[PDB]
Design a protein around this ligand. Structure first.
Ligand SMILES: *[C@H]1O[C@H](CO)[C@@H](O)[C@H](O)[C@@H]1O
Lengths: 109, 109
């Protein structure tokens, strides 16, 4: 079974741009291997932000963008806001499993 | 709000069974993006359905998602022994992404 890897922690300046990444232990994340991103604040339900690696929901701020970066999936957060301070989880999905990473704590300073 | 699924259901081989996924606060609509997942003990769950009724390239034609009454529904037709598994649904909108408690499907031998 594959293991999904996310940075445990990242920091950004309000106004800044930060990149969060999501890797698979079994190889490069390519098309057909779907990444989903979720935002989670303490005491709140998580919210889905990205699906199929780069697609947004109607409630996803344009500041959030998904892509493939090298062999990994990436979530780019531009124009960081105080409200963006949260845990960000990625899942990688294909015929072999729908697998969660350990999450990235984003800190906005 | 809470997502509710039947604790357990049974189907005979070649039989048809329906599993449902309801919201404790209102009727499920297309705007809830119902997802379904299949999981066998000691195995990774696999995604089967997204956006209520959309399938992946690895989703068997036997599985279909719909809205049924005020709930999301997964219909499994011509059931196979390998369909025995725990089935999870998730409901998702701007207010959050929530999993149901899961339905144990038994396929009779
Ligand atoms: C690495 O390879 C495994 C299967 O060999 C997949 O589960 C994973 O998604 C990635 O392709």
């Amino acid at each position: 079974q594959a293991v999904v890897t996310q940075e445990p922690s990242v920091t950004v300046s309000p106004g800044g741009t930060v990149i969060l990444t999501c890797g698979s232990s079994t190889g490069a994340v390519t098309s057909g291997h779907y990444a989903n991103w979720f935002q989670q604040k303490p005491g709140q339900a998580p919210r889905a932000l990205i699906f199929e690696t780069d697609k947004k929901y109607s409630w996803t701020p344009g500041r959030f963008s998904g892509s493939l970066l090298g062999a990994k999936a990436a979530l780019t957060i531009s124009d960081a806001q105080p409200e963006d301070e949260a845990e960000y989880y990625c899942s990688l999905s294909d015929v072999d499993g729908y697998l969660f990473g350990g999450g990235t704590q984003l800190t906005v300073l």
